[PDB]
Design a protein around this ligand. Structure first.
Ligand code: Y5T
Lengths: 268, 14
């Protein structure tokens, strides 16, 4: 490795993405971890760990379809509109993106947004639970798993991913480039011009490779491991199709406490 | 929704 015009351009690209990342996403990883580790003494979230504490935190939970699960997915997708818009604003700042065909821009984003939402959801997660209600609440992992089928299986694979993803200890500077690589995935179905997408991603990959060397001396194969997390992100998205079928094939009672339904609308 | 998400993305790209 040398400091030359090529490497300097890769550092300038990393700074450009990071600055645009800060402008687009007010909920950074640093802010999330500060709440999880109990740093922010002003916003101390309330812990919801069982049905009793669920009722104790009724005030902190702020409020169509027939089935409970479908209304949850409709609600959480509606509450994810702002995040989708933020991701789209971020993609505009990726050099070369807005010059692609508009249909390919839409295709890249319509698949990319789900994976990026899961990436940022991991920031709100530790091994014990997940932040909800805009940092005002903390829903424990085991309480979610204990809920009746099929709800008890909704979030646990995302926790399993988040714990391993968070163990890589990426910061917001890393995540800015990693998210850009996700967006510029040339293997999305329906893409028209794959080559100009791959040309951009190859440059983003080079910037990511250099960023991880400079920022993470403790992990020599971090670049490989981080690209492997793409496969975990896509698997979680594909598991949503199986989830809808489990919901349709469920004959047992799928009634859920209204406060629990509102909490699931804050997840994904 | 797939077409509902595309509409949100297309409008956001404007
Ligand atoms: C919304 C609310 C809760 C959950 N959950 O799994 O607990 C999921 C969703 C949701 O809409 N998820 C989703 C994932 C992937 N792709 C789509 C279209 C939706």
């Amino acid at each position: 490795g040398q400091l030359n015009p090529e490497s300097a351009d890769l550092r300038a690209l990393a700074k450009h993405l990071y600055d645009s990342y800060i402008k687009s996403f007010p909920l950074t990883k640093a802010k999330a971890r500060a709440i999880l580790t109990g740093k922010t003494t002003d916003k101390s979230p309330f812990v919801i760990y069982d049905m009793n504490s669920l009722m104790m935190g009724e005030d902190k939970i702020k409020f169509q379809s027939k089935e409970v699960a479908i209304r949850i997915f409709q609600g959480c997708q509606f509450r994810s509109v702002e995040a989708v818009q933020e991701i789209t604003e971020y993609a505009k700042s990726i050099p070369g993106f807005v010059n692609l065909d508009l249909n390919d821009q839409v295709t890249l984003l319509k698949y990319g947004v789900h994976e990026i939402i899961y990436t940022m959801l991991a920031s709100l997660m530790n091994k014990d639970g997940v932040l909800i209600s805009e940092g005002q609440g903390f829903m424990t992992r085991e309480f979610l798993k204990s809920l009746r089928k099929p709800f008890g299986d909704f979030m646990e694979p995302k926790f399993e991913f988040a714990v391993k993803f968070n163990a890589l200890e990426l910061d917001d500077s890393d995540l800015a480039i990693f998210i850009a690589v996700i967006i510029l995935s040339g293997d999305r179905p329906g893409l028209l011009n794959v080559k100009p997408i791959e040309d951009i991603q190859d440059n983003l990959l080079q910037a990511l490779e250099l960023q991880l060397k400079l920022n993470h001396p403790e992990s020599s194969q971090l670049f490989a491991k981080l690209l492997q997390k793409m496969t975990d992100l896509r698997q979680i998205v594909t598991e949503h199709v199986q989830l809808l079928q489990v919901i349709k094939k469920t004959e047992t009672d799928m009634s859920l406490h209204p406060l629990l339904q509102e909490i699931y609308k804050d997840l994904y | 929704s797939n077409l509902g998400l595309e509409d949100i993305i297309r409008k956001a790209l404007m």
